[PDB]
Amino acid sequence: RGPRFPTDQTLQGRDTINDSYHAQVETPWFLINPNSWGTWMNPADFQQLTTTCREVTLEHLDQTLDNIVIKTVSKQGSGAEETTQYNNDLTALLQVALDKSNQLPWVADNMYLDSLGYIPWRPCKLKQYSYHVNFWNTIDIISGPQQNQWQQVKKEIRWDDLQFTPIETTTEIDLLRTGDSWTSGPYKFNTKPTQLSYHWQSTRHTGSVHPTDPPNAIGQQGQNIRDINGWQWGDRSDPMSAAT
Amino acid sequence: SGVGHSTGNYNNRTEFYYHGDEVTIVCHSSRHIHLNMSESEEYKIYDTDRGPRFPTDQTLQGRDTINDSYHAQVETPWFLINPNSWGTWMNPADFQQLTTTCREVTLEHLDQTLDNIVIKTVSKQGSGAEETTQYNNDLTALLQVALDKSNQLPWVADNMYLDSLGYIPWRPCKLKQYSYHVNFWNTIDIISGPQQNQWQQVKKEIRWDDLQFTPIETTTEIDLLRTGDSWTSGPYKFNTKPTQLSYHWQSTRHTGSVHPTDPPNAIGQQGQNIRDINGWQWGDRSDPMSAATRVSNFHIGYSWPEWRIHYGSGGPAINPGAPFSQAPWSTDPQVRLTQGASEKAIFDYNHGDDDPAHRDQWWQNNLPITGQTNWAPKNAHQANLSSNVPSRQEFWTQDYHNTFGPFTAVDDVGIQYPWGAIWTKTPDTTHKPMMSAHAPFICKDGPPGQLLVKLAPNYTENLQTDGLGNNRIVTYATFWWTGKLILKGKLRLPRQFNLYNLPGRPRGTEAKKFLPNEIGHFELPFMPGRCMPNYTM
Amino acid sequence: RVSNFHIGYSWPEWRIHYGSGGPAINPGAPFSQAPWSTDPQVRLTQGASEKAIFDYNHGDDDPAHRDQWWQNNLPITGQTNWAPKNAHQANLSSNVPSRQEFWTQDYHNTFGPFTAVDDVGIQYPWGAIWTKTPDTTHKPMMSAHAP
Amino acid sequence: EKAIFDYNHGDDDPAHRDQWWQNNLPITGQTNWAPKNAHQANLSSNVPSRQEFWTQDYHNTFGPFTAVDDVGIQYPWGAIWTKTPDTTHKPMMSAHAPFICKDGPPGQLLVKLAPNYTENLQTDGLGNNRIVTYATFWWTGKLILKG
Amino acid sequence: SGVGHSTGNYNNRTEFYYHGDEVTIVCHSSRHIHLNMSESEEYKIYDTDRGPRFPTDQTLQGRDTINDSYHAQVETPWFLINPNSWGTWMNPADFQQLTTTCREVTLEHLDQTLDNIVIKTVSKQGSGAEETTQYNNDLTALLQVALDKSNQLPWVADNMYLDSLGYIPWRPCKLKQYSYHVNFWNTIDIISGPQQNQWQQVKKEIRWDDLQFTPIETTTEIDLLRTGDSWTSGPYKFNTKPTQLSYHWQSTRHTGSVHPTDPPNAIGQQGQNIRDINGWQWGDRSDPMSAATRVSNFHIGYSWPEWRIHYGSGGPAINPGAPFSQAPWSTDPQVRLTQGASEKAIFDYNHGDDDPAHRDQWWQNNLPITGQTNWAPKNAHQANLSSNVPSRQEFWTQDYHNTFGPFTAVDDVGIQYPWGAIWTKTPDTTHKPMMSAHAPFICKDGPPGQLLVKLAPNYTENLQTDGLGNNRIVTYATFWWTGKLILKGKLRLPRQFNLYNLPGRPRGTEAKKFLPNEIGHFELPFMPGRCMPNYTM
């Protein structure tokens, strides 16, 4: 179920918001995704972006893999000495799958922050690809007399309706020796821009301004005009006000 | 062409055309229509009794008022032919072939004809104890046909009350009389009285001073057909968006990245959720990293005050909410949970009931669709989402709020094979609706057709004599309707390794139903039309 | 009867926003109260009615006095949904539910993907012709006043 | 939203995870706290009574008249793009990722290290099937932006 | 190209192409093959023990002799790669899409390659208590590949004993050693002894004076491959006739014109056969006109001495008879009726068993195929067919005769998805066989391929030293096999009004099987391959 999920009704179902229960299929594949800001830009270059740009779009993406190095560790000795030796296997393969057709479950976003590291000179370590299969976790927090009890209605993995897609049958896989490299080819986005500025106006800041005569000196406050001719909502006459 | 030449052939079958990803479905249909002399030759405007089961007393304190049939209508002396339904066009085997091999489908265009007009006049003979009837065909009698391609008439053509051409090809079809609403005020107050336990009729009337009455004659041009004549509608081209033929099982808990888990070691063990992980959350969340509080980009499904009764002007109505299955919350079978915006189809002998003078039922509860399922009572909200768990205060279990918003993704019901309507009229308003509660296809331009036929009157020797007499000669007609609408699908290919579970008859049903009986009585099977799982995202 | 769409929507009518910058008001959909009007004496504002004060140059006859109008949108009906009048049930079945399972006065927002609604339209003497489109993600669908 | 993060993702201390919790302080005027709001039966020159005034409803007031903003881009930890769920009525805007992909999202690149088996295969018997192996390779990419 | 460049990509998937009635199935497949140093480097000719369960005594009086494994073979030091099976080529979902949308299918042509050769040599280190092993790859070592396109070698490549590439794509495949029979005489007399209750070995020997021994080296040209090298077979084009993907339910009682019947009146009644009708019959038939004795043009199915044991030269064998279902005669489930020429498939972990070190079973009994069903004991014959009924004499119940003749129509088993062989060698004889008992496709010309690979030997410093030493260096290889065979199908369209019952998992099975486990173990489902009813005529 997860960490902090209730075993008892003392907190009467409010702990059930902590629920990690899921059913998954884990492939033996590792995911490379550059989906994050800061994989792409360092702080100074995001600042230059953010000051000089009113809004921004994604144009297109391109990515490669190269300089493959595959080694095999070989233990040596009696185990008290435990000498390890690192030999590179020149004929070993690294195999690369990219689905341009999006036939696989997508599951690639930063939630749990599985992404390439932000600072350029550290090594990055991949996380294993996996995706959900259908399951029923339904939990009743209204259960019991007085409706203070929580209960598991139906918790199961649904097998009769399930869909399992391997990487091998879905897409074509490239096999790479050491001297080989891989390029994805161009990918063109189509999306709408995002505003880089924030809006401070509510509906009280937006429209025409309530008639006010100005203050006379530095101490005084503006003075709202009592009788004005504008529109209102309900029957409003005497109380003309910017709220209504 | 003449009296002794048949004007058109009978073709009822569909054939499929597969090229690449495109699949073209051309489904022909032909019907033998029985037409009776119109009941009265004049337009009538009247209102109705309240209805069956409406309360006369406050014992049930207004809850019965959900049964309200009261309306005011104008009935024209015209009969409506509409082919708006699935199963007018396709038999079960050909809808199965559609549903297995197509990922999604559109309406391409529609065409329809009328021909082989036969008009007869019944003539009584004898003293009434013998009562010999004679059927003579009047070669010069007329059948008159109105089709509005301009949609100037009130539309009122959809399967609700299931006025549509019969589903099985070899039975005769019988038309229903065209009529439409006029404005009236039905408003009912269920809050009335002290303690607000009383229901009261606020204002129930037909509004005359503002009313609009449009006859068929002044609206459109009418074709008059003798026996040797035929009629063709000409082509009608749809413009609408496709409908998905697959159902989505993913909720927002199935959709995104998966909570980090280390695998189990052997066949008995369970996966183990990692305690300390670095992901995003919503409120202040640190120690309790959990898939429930994982931030996601979208949300799937929305809550609603399920079975909302509108009580607008014109009567109590019902505001649907989103379709979903109650199967996850189903528990015991005995009780029937309707709250998933389920629909129920009554139907008759010609519409796929086996027994004459009885009406079989179905009630699709949309069992395949899950992950869109939101039962309003089950939900909750908190004041703050933090590492701490709130108190008894700050937590509210039974609100029933509408949670539809800018972040939600939902599904329409889809096509419901035997009884479901194919298309619909788009109401002309600011902000047209986003999606339809029933009919899968919205017509961006006007909907097709709305074909109307009336049997022109045959008057006796003397006219407007009245005096406990009958004005005109008893007459009826039989003619043949043929039409084809073309569909464009997109080929469905396997997206998974394991076997799909392919379309077929409903689970509880056997195959002795759906097949003709010793008398020839059989039922058509319900087909989901959204038939297979697919990844939402 | 099942229908493909629904016309009009409920709202917590005369919602006061209390956002940053002050209490404001969140309109709801325009409709007539004439079906629920009953006696004339009482004035039912709940149809998202609007009132126009105006001055001599703007079409008042008397100088140094301000005439009023208050359009209540009497012609528009069938979009009319008074929130209190509505109800919801637990189940819709051949049986009629009990005193429990039936809730009369919720005041919920029933706007959704199935609803069709109308803007007020042009209001001749005092109504504004056009408006600025606020630049935000998801521009508004329709305007509460300007046509 | 709150972002936990690790050493490679911009935490300074190894074996510990720093936190942030963006509360979106700059964005105001969109601020609506549900409890603070209210609704009245009638809006008139008169002020309603204790009845007709309801303070704590918690209703959804999203409707055809509302304009709102997405969060925007959140630099270190925020995701750039997202998959559009294929459903009737695609969502209007995203709760987190600033960019929605109208067509399919890019990529989803997967790599596996092909297995190196020892002399004998499927021997089992408390043995290991394959040779211990690891790889290091270089990923390079460029995405272009238009501002 | 070189040491550090991969020679070919991994592609395992199938894609379908629909144009008109034609559907093109291109099914790619790719495997990772583990190859061990050949056991001995020389050709060996030897015979074997009789077998497991063969009788040493006459207690069961010869009936055990049906268990006979005795044979004489020549084992080459070569390993066989054959992709002859369904399920090497297709996963369950893609065989389902084939089987639903195709009426019949042919083999178009085959192509296959080998690449990414990796050869390593294991080197022991230490005293043997530590026993440190080291795996070094020999860059100059050779892997040698023989393919006979001329079919000069004994064919011996089919799934019986299921020597074939594994069905699921991501597991490694392990080859079996190539060998073939040499002539021997196994003849066994089960009639021996007084009272003929004794079994005796007549002559059991390997015949040397007439024998033919063909090595791989002198027969065909051999390619030698280093690491950077690859190998392609070139195209191979099949010529064979199609196989039906639908099953026939009609017997000769279902086939023809129907006996005259007047209909029933109501839902309870039975049809009523007309007493006096004018049709054809067989013998003198007049008063007893009956559908049993109706003359027909053909007969469907034939009797056989079911489970005939041949006892030819070379051993007891079994002569199949025609495939059919025992379901009509099934009665109680407990007893298992094998007589329909049923087949049983044992299989292993890589071939679709879930549990390692255990072998799951299937036993297809061909339940869908009926109307071809003839159980020999049930039949009878009479002296005369007349209006009279014969006596106790003239009627013979239990003959067991072969009734195959010029008038009979029969069906082959068809394709059996997971374990069934795709094609077969045509034996070259006068009068080639008419149809095959197992493999759906007969190769009119030579069958494809029969690809053989051996790992060339790595000898130590000293050669032919013997003296309780090992001659050569321990070595093994891993390489990648890829191939595609193309199919031509014919589109399947609905021939009926009612819903078909579409392909899917077997009836008794659930869907938790056929899906990966917590460990990753799963079974592939049996698919009938003749999946749907069709009118025989």
Author numbering:
A (entry chain Q): 82 to 325
B (entry chain E), E (entry chain P): 33 to 569
C (entry chain F): 326 to 472
D (entry chain Q): 375 to 521
Lines quoted from the article behind this entry:
The BuVs, along with CuV and TuV belong to the genus Protoparvovirus, which prior the BuV discovery contained only animal (non-human) infecting viruses, and are classified as novel Primate protoparvovirus 1 species. The VP ORF encodes for two overlapping structural proteins, VP1 and VP2, sixty copies of which assemble their T = 1 icosahedral capsid in a predicted 1:10 ratio. The VP2 monomer extracted from the refined 60-mer capsids of the BuVs contained the core β-strands (βA–βI) and α-helix A (αA) observed in other parvoviruses and large loop insertions between these secondary structure elements. However, unlike the animal protoparvoviruses, the bufavirus capsid contain three separated protrusions surrounding the 3-fold axes, as has been reported for members of the Dependoparvovirus genus, human parvovirus B19, and the HBoVs.
